[PDB]
Each structure stands twice: as structure tokens, then as C-alpha cells.
Design a protein around this ligand. Structure first.
Ligand code: COH
Ligand code: COH
Ligand SMILES: *[C@@H]1O[C@H](CO)[C@@H](O[C@@H]2O[C@H](CO)[C@@H](O[C@H]3O[C@H](CO)[C@@H](O)[C@H](O)[C@@H]3O)[C@H](O)[C@H]2NC(C)=O)[C@H](O)[C@H]1NC(C)=O
Ligand SMILES: *[C@@H]1O[C@H](CO)[C@@H](O[C@@H]2O[C@H](CO)[C@@H](O)[C@H](O)[C@H]2NC(C)=O)[C@H](O)[C@H]1NC(C)=O
Ligand SMILES: *[C@@H]1O[C@H](CO)[C@@H](O[C@@H]2O[C@H](CO)[C@@H](O)[C@H](O)[C@H]2NC(C)=O)[C@H](O)[C@H]1NC(C)=O
Ligand SMILES: *[C@@H]1O[C@H](CO)[C@@H](O[C@@H]2O[C@H](CO)[C@@H](O)[C@H](O)[C@H]2NC(C)=O)[C@H](O)[C@H]1NC(C)=O
Ligand SMILES: CCCCC/C=C\C/C=C\C/C=C\C/C=C\CCCC(=O)O
Ligand SMILES: CCCCC/C=C\C/C=C\C/C=C\C/C=C\CCCC(=O)O
Ligand SMILES: CCCCCCCCO[C@@H]1O[C@H](CO)[C@@H](O)[C@H](O)[C@H]1O
Ligand SMILES: CCCCCCCCO[C@@H]1O[C@H](CO)[C@@H](O)[C@H](O)[C@H]1O
Ligand SMILES: *[C@@H]1O[C@H](CO)[C@@H](O)[C@H](O)[C@H]1NC(C)=O
Ligand SMILES: *[C@@H]1O[C@H](CO)[C@@H](O)[C@H](O)[C@H]1NC(C)=O
Lengths: 552, 551
């Protein structure tokens, strides 16, 4: 078997076989040396002694509200702290990207082929004696057993951070522009070739789909008006392919950028909101530029909405998730004197960690109604019946589920949760502890340390035998949460660097793009730099209902 | 018409229409302000006070041979100077890229669509009163007249830098991996979706083609043996599509990564050499790694060859072009403490400026023969008859033409030269002087200043009227060359930033790739770092004939 199977090289050293039974570690720029890159250099030793843990930093950021109130209201300090936040999480992602499901060594095929998700850790070699390399049993535990024992919801566990359904559906809508698994090829392949925030879930992945969705007047997207309300156009009107069961009425077959968004009214709510936002921005730009044609109006509005998206994601969405008292800031300028690569490749593991199915409630409560999963799926008539105003009001008030802490995956989606485990295995993912080390975290030394409790930890000990072969996906959903938090440490520490790269790596954040003229002038630039989840709803939903990512 | 037609915004300021009859300039980060971004900020004044011109910097680098000999022998000083060379040429290229032939404004379509060549300057708007904007006549001079008066060769003008046929064919072979115009779509579109040094001209652009070219044993590429000599396989053997005239016999239809390389025997020479290089590196890696399979051997060899290519291009090719006494260095580590984007998009203007057809001789002289263009083209039996060793020996001694200085485009390729002008106009290229300012060069104030002589200048004045509507491409071929040099100022100052971006922008130059393990360990890494035009030939050509890009 491959001599690197045991993952002998530490501290980001790279393993290479040098014969049938021998390996060499490449310790270049790791700050360590010796056979396994475990002997620290002098400066590294001092740097390690001075580095606070993620849990300590989290503590500081979630306490001393008095201090953060001063910091937030002093622009120079806020920018300084945000610059720290951005740069500290930056160095953790390979960019240009390296490994993928088929390549555990760097290659031009892995670099150049955009159809792959990239990989933060190489796959376990095909000939390793155990699924995780050399540790553990010949087989991993039955995925159904892991699922039922420690993942499935017994009783609904609410998010103590107060995340609502506006948040849950934003997460699903937003991420599905870049997590678009090519099931025809396999779980390691993506259909989102833009690899980030390109708003293809609104505009379509291909030029052909985009043009079918456009009005070709005033830069606008096609639409219909049902009972005086603007909705996306239909499949029949556009010839835009969507996924719908055969029994869905023609006018309820809405066509949008992402083919799967007819799946739930929660996604269609946001699809409709963003469609309206695009056309509203078109109106503004037409007023500013009566001399512009349809093509420039369309393209400029798209860039503006990309900006709006990144703004909202950082300052509202991530802000909410973080629980920080410090106010995070979207400001591309903070990186202009820093070293940063304006590019991104979506990581398979980023997709995996983002399977936040515990967010889902047992029922979807709109107005006076409480809809089951069966009633809610593929049912746009619910959206039209209640209207967007009621949707916002109800979703803002409805609590979402806790993601970490265990046993909160709704039974309705048990198959999807099982698929996350099975596909992790197909893609030959390394263990939880290997991923912890890859992101500068201390490996867990017991199952009890992972969960912070006794019962689930005992089930996992009996299932897996060794903490060193515990798997990433199930660990993220059973991990002990931060105090009164939605997530454990591992979720935040892997998630945040991937998120940063996807957000700040966008071309619009680069110096040659981050200029008023890029966005049709100061008016267009202002739309971006003042966007909020509240202004989004206020501008595009009748009655301007209050909204938030938290129930409060 | 478009209010930006006159290109009012100076110093990298962006023009935007604000109503039918009005514009506004965006002066963000240009170091200037005011309506047209022409009022310098204080620090900019001090910068513009100290900054030497490209001409004086060239002088310094091409004189004081004694001082440079000392400098070249102190690694720290050599590193420091090479770092300056790299970083000064950096800020000039938009990366991530911006404009293209269809987009005079930034758009997601322009950013995300890799089928386009990008544009260093946006196209002139479709409704502008004159081809260049507002200046000059309603029509540009007949391109046939421009070609005949100032471009076409009378007497052959040899390159005073002593560039040879090894250099001319290397230039053609190397650049045709990233200049691959998609004629089906138009001159502003490319088939080279990797946009740089990916060696698709050896391995194929698509995975299907690569797989047809590969042996699937020992990481190797398919080949044939003719008279004990290794050549590329046939179209018949591989099912790899190539461009050949119908009369070319099956045995002479060589299959290589780039579809057009069978059309010129000098291109097939390098295709053969590099194919041999790949299989040689496979042999070396296989004895370093007896445990490795075909796939890893192949992929690692490709990466090594990409590194060899960049090494040779900087240290032999650009070195020769530059005429510098300073020894240029390929060292990715020089940028590790610098702000630099490891990405590239091929610019249409880079393609345009690389149309060095004055380089081509009147005849191709191999051994005792002198082949006309008609005899040379599509004729790979010449390669087989003479052999690679003779090709190298002959091409090493045969001198190429001077590119700048005017009147040196061989008659045989007059239609291609005319196409370069016509396609520049089709793509709505801005003027020579607009491009000069874009690259921090002073505009030319007269045709005489451009050419450094009287006769061609007078012809161009009669054809164009105003120096400010002179076109970029013909200007590069008629421009006053540097003293005893192959090129003038505009060629170098536009060419060098596009070049170093394509070379250093490659992912293998990034910190996570630039490590011995990426290349199979220290042996594979050393192959890259010791590669030269001479070693390429010596390792792969019977007899190890002597070679270089000069003489
Ligand atoms: C962000 C949290 C989140 C939520 C709230 C959510 C809500 C729901 C939901 C109820 C509204 C249902 C019925 C499903 C059902 C599915 N989910 Co999500 N999912 C979520 C995160 C994800 C992610 C991330 C993926 C991977 C997408 C991919 O790779 O295509 C996913 C994959 C899936 C897939 C298979 C991928 C595909 O074919 O596109 C199904 C089916 N699911 N999910
Ligand atoms: C770098 C120097 C160089 C040399 C030595 C060279 C040598 C030769 C040569 C003799 C061996 C012949 C017969 C040709 C003939 C041609 N060249 Co060049 N070419 C060169 C640089 C280029 C470049 C660059 C292009 C554009 C390639 C593209 O865009 O596909 C080109 C394009 C062409 C075309 C396509 C026509 C068009 O409209 O662009 C023809 C035909 N030619 N060339
Ligand atoms: C990016 O990587 C993908 C995975 O390798 C690749 O898809 C694969 O493409 C190859 C070659 O095009 C297909 O193999 C085919 O080749 C011959 C036909 O003569 C047969 O042996 C096979 O049956 C098959 O038809 C693979 O099927 C395919 N693999 C998949 C879909 O998983 C993409 O082509 C790569 N993309 C780019 C741009 O290179
Ligand atoms: C580098 O790692 C290797 C293999 O992981 C180490 O070898 C192990 O050493 C430990 C001692 O703590 C033993 O428990 C194992 O039996 C060894 N495993 C194998 C397969 O050799 C090696 O000692 C490490 N090298 C250094 C210099 O620390
Ligand atoms: C900015 O540039 C514009 C256009 O080049 C200048 O306006 C022109 O100036 C010339 C000479 O002064 C006039 O003859 C034209 O009538 C103007 N053309 C126009 C307005 O389209 C303008 O002077 C420059 N502005 C500044 C502040 O220097
Ligand atoms: C990049 O741009 C080109 C030019 O617009 C696109 O090619 C066009 O695609 C449309 C719609 O599918 C076709 O009707 C035309 O035949 C194409 N025009 C051509 C060939 O010039 C191309 O699809 C774009 N690439 C991507 C990935 O969207
Ligand atoms: C570095 C960029 C912003 C800094 C973020 C700082 C702290 C983040 C705090 C909590 C984030 C929690 C989980 C992250 C998981 C996915 C990221 C979601 C955002 C996205 O889908 O993109
Ligand atoms: C497209 C990516 C590939 C990069 C292209 C590589 C080489 C092109 C070579 C030369 C371009 C034309 C003129 C500049 C040449 C010599 C001047 C010295 C350059 C320097 O002192 O720096
Ligand atoms: C409720 C959703 C399906 C559950 C599948 C039952 C599998 C048995 O799982 C058991 O569940 C018990 C109750 O939570 C736990 O106390 C045990 O530790 C666990 O083994
Ligand atoms: C020795 C020829 C040098 C060219 C000097 C400029 C005059 C060119 O004259 C033109 O030359 C073309 C190519 O020969 C011909 O196709 C044209 O018919 C001819 O008019
Ligand atoms: C869809 O929603 C409507 C109300 O809008 C409801 O009457 C119906 O039961 C739902 N359809 C299904 C199949 O559950
Ligand atoms: C091709 O070259 C050979 C010399 O090897 C010569 O005999 C033949 O005439 C050439 N063919 C053409 C069409 O010029």
C-alpha cells in the first residue's frame, strides 16, 4: 500500500513516496523541519507560544460589549480589526488550488479542470489498509447506524442563537449558486464553473439560459404579474428547463437561474426578491443613464447585485452566525495593501460542512397555517396564496434548528444526511482529526471531548473505536457547540476561511474593479455599500415588512 | 455619438457616459484628479520627477558590461535587480482582467468568458465619428497602401542582434500555445482557454485529445520510430485531428498537441524535440519512483516541462531579445514577499504585437538546400530527409530579419501582414499613441519621431495625416529601433508586461506549487532549474549539436 497512508507529514508538510515502502515529507515554508515536519523552527516556537486558541479569540469577540461598542464606532479601529479578521483566516486556503478527488498530488489536470470541486486535503489513497489510512477497523460503521444513533432528530432542538427561517432559506438560496453537484459525474464534480458568487442562481450558468431569462429591454429579467404581484416567468414562456414534478400547473412552473429552486417556496421567495431587485436596479440605472442600452444596463445591474450579495453575506449573514459584538465590515480596500489572490475554487469539504440540515423545522409555519414537508415541497401555490409580505413576516418569526450538539437532523431528509456520509466515503475523505490539524486545531483525544457529553460519545466509541477515525460530516453535527451557539469550533474554523476566499476573492473586490465607474457611477456604488437584508426586503416586498436573520 | 469617443480621461482614468452628450472620469487610485485626471497629486509629482524613461533604463542595462559582470556574480544583487525588473512590469496589466472586443465597460460576461482574448484598452465605440475616435479622417488609409509603402521587404534586413532560425521557430512554437484565434467566432476570440503556458501545443487542449496522444505506459506520449529516430505518431495511429492539405500522405501526417504544427517543418522540429523531452523526463522519474503509475508519471512530467519552458523563455529567449548585460533569472521566490496575482488572461494586443513576420527569411537554408516558402510549407519530408541534427545546425547559423525599422515583411506572407492591420481595425483598436500612454510612454509628436527617418515618415503622413491616429501594428514594424536592436521602444514596453505576467502568473510559480515534491522530489525540481535551450537540444537530438538563439 501507499507509504503515505498513515498521513505521516505534519504541519502542512507534503507526503511523497520515494519507493514502495518509503516516504519523504516536503517541509518547505511550513516553519517546521525534520522527518515528519514536527521540529519547529525558533521563530515558529515563539509564534506558537504567542498564538491564542480559536476558543479564546471567540470568547473575546463574544464578550466585553462595552469595549466593542467603542471599537465599532471608531472607523479606524473597526477597519484595523476587520483587516486582522480577513488576513488571519486567509493563509489557510491553497490558492491557486491543488488537490481534488482524483489527484492526491498536484497536477495540471487538477489545476485546470473546473468541473472538479477542489480538496483541502488529498483523498486517502485507494490501496490503504483502512478507510482512513492505517487506523481503525477494516470497515467504517454502517452509515445508517451513525445516522440513527447520533444524527436523527428525536425532539426539535431550537437554535439558541435565534436563527430564523429567513436565515435558513437565505443560506440555502445563497450557497446553491456554488454548491451544484454534477450527479451525472459524481459527488466530487460541480456544475458551478464560476466557483463562487457569480449569481448564476439568478442569471443562469450558461449564456443560453441567461438570454432565455432576459427581457432584452431596459436591462431587465423577464417576469409575470399575478394578482398585481411580480413573479418569475414560466418554463413555457421562457423555454428555461426547471426540475418540477409532472403534476405542477403551468403558471406555477416558475423559471429562474437555478434549476432546482422550484423545490421549495422558501427558495422561490428569495428568487422572486432578487429578480425584483435586479429590475429595480435597472430602473435606477436607466434614470442615471438614459443613453445606455439594454446590454450595459443588464451587465451593470448584475455587478451591483453581486456587490449587494457580498455586502449582505458579510455584514448581516456572517455577522449573525458569528455571534460577535464586533461589527464585521465589507470593504475590499482593507486588502489593497495586503497579499491576496482574487480567485477561488470551491472545495468539496466546504460543500460537506454546509449540509446544515438540522436548520430545518418540523413544520413550515406561514400565517395561521403549519405545513408539513410533503405539503411544502414543490408547492409554489403556498407562496402565491400567502404572498411575499406574509412569507417574510412568518419566516422572520419562526425559529430554526441547532446544527451542532447532535440529534437534530429532521427525519424527512434522513436520506440526504445519509448521502453526505456515504459520499464523503466515496470521495475518500481523511478523518475529522486530520481536518482539525489542517486548520490549526488540536486533534480531539476522545469522543467525550468531541461531544462534551456521555451518551452520544459512548455510541460513537462503540461505532468507530478510535477518535482518530471519526468522520468529518457526522462530527460537525454532534460537536459540542460554543456556549449558546449554533456551531462547534470545527464548523467555524473550516467554514470561515472558505467563506472569506469565496467572498473577498471575487473580481469585483479587486482594485481595478472596486471603483464607482464599474457600477455605473456613485449611485450604483452606493446601492452596494448600503445594502442590507432589511433594505433588500424593504425595496422589493409590498409593505416593507421588518426582517432579520434572528427571531429575537 | 458616444461621449467617450475622444478618450478624454488620462493616466488610467476610466471614462463613463453621463447622459447623451457628457462624460465623467473616474480617477480612483490613478494618482491624479480633475475632470480628465490630469492634475497630479503631490506624491505623484515627486514620483514623476525621479522616474527615469524606458530609454535611459535600456541604456543602463545595455552598457557598463564590466559593472554587470560583477553584478551577475553577486547572487543577492542579481536577485534584487531581477525583483525590480519583475515588479516594475507588474502594475501595468489588469489582473483580474477587464475589457474585451465586445465590452468597453467591465462586465461579468467579460470577466468570466474565457473564449475571449482580453483587452488592455477598451475598443473604440461603434458610433464614433472616426475609426480612432474623433481624430483623423472618416476612413483609415487603405491597408494595402500601408503594407506596400512601409511594411513589405525590398532587400532582406538581417537582425543586428543576430537572432537565428532557432529563435524564430521557438517564438512561433512557444506563442502558438496561447495565441490560437478561434476564426469561427472572430479575431477577438481564442481556443487557448488555459490562457498561458500549459503546454497544450504538446499535450492537446482537451482531455480527449491528450488521451489519444498518450501511450498510457510509463507516463509517456505515443511516438513512432523512423530510421532509428523518434518522431510524433501519425493521425492514422492516434485519430488525432490535424490541419493538413489533402495531398499530404498518411505517413507524413504527424499528430501533435497543436493542430497547426504540421504546416511548418520548423514547428515540427520543436514538436519532436519536446515530445522527446517529455518521454526522457518520464524515464528519469520512473527510476526515481519505481512505485509510481502511468498517470502520476505523465502529470509530473507535464509540470516539469512547464517549468523547463518558463526557465528557457526567461533565461535564454527573453535574455537574447533584451540585449541586456544583466543576467535575467527565473526565480518564483522573488515574488513571495510581493503583491502579485497568480493568474493570467491573454490580451488581444499581446497577440497583435507578436506578429513578428519580418523575422522570416527569404529562403530556409538547411544543409546545402535553400527552400522557398512554397517548398517549405506543409513539407515534413524535409525534416525526415535532413534529420533533426542538421535542422538544428542549419537553423542555428541562419540569421532572422529585423522586426522594427520598417520594410522587412517578406512578400510571401503579405496577406497575413494585411490581415493583422485589417483585424486590428475590425476589433476597433485604439491608436498607437493611446496604447503608448496606456503603458506610461510619451505620445509621438510626429511620424519622423516614430520612424527616426524621413522617407517612411513622409509616406505615413500622407496616408494618416495625424500622428494621433497612427495604428499600433504597422507602427511596431516601422518604429525606430533601439541602437542595433531588433525592436523599438513600443514593442518592448508593451510586450514585457504581458510576457512576465504569462510566465510568473503560472500556478507552478505560486508558493504552494513551487516545492520539490510538486515535481517528484529534488531531481525533478533540478531539471526545471537547470533547463536551457542548449540542454533541451543536447538531451534530445542525436550528436548534441551546439545551439543558441543567436548567430
Ligand atoms: C444551507 C442549509 C440547507 C438547507 C436549509 C437545506 C434544505 C433542504 C430541503 C428543505 C427545504 C430539502 C428538501 C433539501 C434536500 C436536498 N439537499 Co439541502 N439544504 C441545505 C444545504 C444543502 C447543501 C449545501 C447541499 C449540497 C448541494 C449540492 O452539492 O448540489 C444540499 C443537498 C441537497 C439535496 C441533493 C443535491 C441536489 O440534488 O441538488 C437534496 C435533495 N443541501 N435540502
Ligand atoms: C512569433 C513569430 C512568428 C513567426 C516566426 C511566424 C511564422 C509564420 C510562417 C512561417 C513559418 C508562416 C507561413 C506564417 C503564417 C501565418 N501566421 Co505567423 N508567425 C509568427 C507569429 C504569429 C502569431 C503570434 C499569429 C497569431 C496566431 C493566432 O492568433 O492564432 C500568426 C498568425 C499566422 C497566420 C494566420 C492568419 C491570421 O489571420 O492570423 C498565418 C497564415 N503568426 N507565420
Ligand atoms: C474534467 O475531468 C472529467 C473527469 O475526468 C472529464 O470527464 C471525462 O472525460 C473523458 C474524456 O473526454 C471521458 O472518457 C471518455 O473517453 C472514451 C471515449 O473514446 C471512453 O473510454 C469513455 O467511455 C468516455 O466516453 C469520461 O467519461 C469523463 N469522465 C466523467 C464524465 O466523469 C472532463 O472531460 C474534464 N473536462 C475537461 C474540460 O477536460
Ligand atoms: C515520523 O513518523 C513515523 C511514522 O509515523 C515515526 O515512526 C513511528 O514512531 C513511533 C514512536 O513514537 C512508533 O510508535 C511507531 O512504531 C513508528 N511507526 C512506524 C511505522 O515507523 C517516526 O519515528 C517519525 N520520525 C521522527 C523523526 O519523529
Ligand atoms: C478635459 O478634456 C476636455 C476634452 O478634451 C476639454 O474640453 C475641451 O477642451 C478644448 C480645448 O480647451 C476645447 O476646445 C473643447 O471645446 C473642449 N471639448 C469638449 C468640452 O468636449 C477640457 O478642457 C478638459 N478639462 C480640464 C479641466 O482640463
Ligand atoms: C462566450 O461568448 C461567446 C460569444 O457571445 C458565446 O458564443 C455564443 O453563444 C451563443 C448562445 O449560446 C450562440 O448563439 C452563438 O453561436 C455564440 N456566438 C459566437 C460563437 O460568437 C459563448 O457561448 C460564451 N461562452 C460561455 C461559456 O458562455
Ligand atoms: C473571513 C471572512 C469573514 C470572516 C468571518 C469571521 C468569523 C465567521 C464566524 C462564523 C462563521 C460560521 C460558520 C462558517 C461556515 C460557513 C460560512 C458561511 C458564509 C459563506 O457561505 O460564505
Ligand atoms: C502569454 C504568457 C507567456 C508569456 C510570454 C513570454 C515571452 C514573450 C517574450 C517577449 C515579448 C516581447 C517583447 C519583450 C521582450 C524583451 C524585452 C525584455 C523584457 C524584460 O526585460 O522583462
Ligand atoms: C428518533 C429518530 C430515529 C431514531 C432511531 C432509533 C435508533 C436507536 O438509537 C438510540 O436512541 C436512543 C434514544 O435517543 C439513545 O438513547 C441511544 O443512545 C441510541 O442508541
Ligand atoms: C520586390 C517587391 C518589394 C515591394 C515594394 C513595394 C511595391 C509592392 O508592389 C506590390 O507587391 C505585391 C507583392 O509583390 C504584389 O502582390 C502587388 O501586385 C504589387 O503591386
Ligand atoms: C399546496 O399548498 C396548498 C395551499 O397553497 C394546499 O392546499 C395543498 O394541500 C398543497 N398541495 C399539496 C400536494 O400538499
Ligand atoms: C517537399 O520537399 C522535398 C525535399 O525533401 C522536395 O522534393 C519537394 O519538391 C517538396 N514539395 C513541394 C510541393 O514543394
Amino acid at each position: 500500500h501507499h507509504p503515505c497512508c498513515s498521513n505521516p507529514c505534519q504541519n502542512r508538510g507534503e507526503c511523497m513516496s520515494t519507493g514502495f515502502d518509503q516516504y519523504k515529507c516536503d517541509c518547505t515554508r511550513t516553519g517546521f523541519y525534520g522527518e515528519n515536519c514536527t521540529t519547529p523552527e525558533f521563530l515558529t516556537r515563539i509564534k506558537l507560544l504567542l498564538k491564542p486558541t480559536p476558543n479564546t479569540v471567540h470568547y473575546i469577540l463574544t464578550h466585553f460589549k462595552g469595549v466593542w461598542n467603542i471599537v465599532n464606532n471608531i472607523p479606524f479601529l473597526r477597519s484595523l480589526i476587520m483587516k486582522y479578521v480577513l488576513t488571519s483566516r486567509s493563509y489557510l486556503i491553497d490558492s491557486p488550488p491543488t488537490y481534488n478527488v482524483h489527484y492526491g498530488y498536484k497536477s495540471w489536470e487538477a489545476f485546470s479542470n473546473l468541473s472538479y470541486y477542489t480538496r483541502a486535503l488529498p483523498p486517502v489513497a485507494d490501496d490503504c489498509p483502512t478507510p482512513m489510512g492505517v487506523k481503525g477497523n477494516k470497515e467504517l460503521p454502517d452509515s445508517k447506524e451513525v445516522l440513527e444513533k447520533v444524527l436523527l432528530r428525536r425532539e426539535f432542538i431550537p437554535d439558541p442563537q435565534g436563527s430564523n427561517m429567513m436565515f435558513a432559506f437565505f443560506a440555502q438560496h445563497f450557497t446553491h449558486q456554488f454548491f451544484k453537484t454534477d450527479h451525472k459525474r459524481g459527488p466530487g464534480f460541480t456544475r458551478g464553473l464560476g466557483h463562487g458568487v457569480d449569481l448564476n442562481h439568478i442569471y443562469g450558468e450558461t449564456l443560453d439560459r441567461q438570454h432565455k431569462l432576459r427581457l432584452f429591454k431596459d436591462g431587465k429579467l423577464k417576469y409575470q404579474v399575478i394578482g398585481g404581484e411580480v413573479y418569475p416567468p414560466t418554463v413555457k414562456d421562457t423555454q428555461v428547463e426547471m426540475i418540477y414534478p409532472p403534476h405542477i400547473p403551468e403558471n406555477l412552473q416558475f423559471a429562474v437561474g437555478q434549476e432546482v429552486f422550484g423545490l421549495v417556496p422558501g427558495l422561490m421567495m428569495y428568487a422572486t426578491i432578487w429578480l425584483r431587485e435586479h429590475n429595480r436596479v435597472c430602473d435606477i440605472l436607466k434614470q442615471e443613464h438614459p443613453e445606455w442600452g439594454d446590454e450595459q444596463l443588464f451587465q451593470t445591474s448584475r455587478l451591483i447585485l453581486i456587490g449587494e450579495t457580498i455586502k449582505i453575506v458579510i455584514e448581516d449573514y456572517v455577522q449573525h452566525l458569528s455571534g460577535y459584538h464586533f461589527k464585521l465590515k465589507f470593504d475590499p480596500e482593507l486588502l489593497f495593501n495586503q497579499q491576496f489572490q482574487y480567485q477561488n475554487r470551491i472545495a468539496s469539504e466546504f460543500n460537506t460542512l454546509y449540509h446544515w440540515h438540522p436548520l430545518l423545522p418540523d413544520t413550515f409555519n406561514i400565517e395561521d397555517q403549519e405545513y408539513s414537508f410533503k405539503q411544502f415541497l414543490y408547492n409554489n401555490s403556498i407562496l402565491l396564496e400567502h404572498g411575499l409580505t406574509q412569507f417574510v413576516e412568518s419566516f422572520t418569526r419562526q425559529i430554526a434548528g441547532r446544527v451542532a450538539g447532535g440529534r437534530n437532523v429532521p427525519i424527512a431528509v434522513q436520506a440526504v444526511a445519509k448521502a453526505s456520509i456515504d459520499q464523503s466515503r466515496e470521495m475518500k475523505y481523511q478523518s475529522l482529526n486530520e481536518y482539525r490539524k489542517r486548520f490549526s486545531l488540536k486533534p480531539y483525544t476522545s469522543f467525550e471531548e468531541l461531544t462534551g457529553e456521555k451518551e452520544m460519545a459512548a455510541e460513537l466509541k462503540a461505532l468507530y473505536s478510535d477518535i482518530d477515525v471519526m468522520e468529518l460530516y457526522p462530527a460537525l453535527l454532534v460537536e459540542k457547540p460554543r456556549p449558546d451557539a449554533i456551531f462547534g469550533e470545527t464548523m467555524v474554523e473550516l467554514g470561515a476561511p472558505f467563506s472569506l476566499k469565496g467572498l473577498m476573492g471575487n473580481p469585483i473586490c479587486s482594485p481595478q474593479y472596486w471603483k464607482p465607474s464599474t457600477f455605473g457611477g456613485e449611485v450604483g456604488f452606493k446601492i452596494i455599500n448600503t445594502a442590507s437584508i432589511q433594505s433588500l426586503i424593504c425595496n422589493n416586498v409590498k409593505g416593507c415588512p421588518f426582517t432579520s436573520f434572528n427571531v429575537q
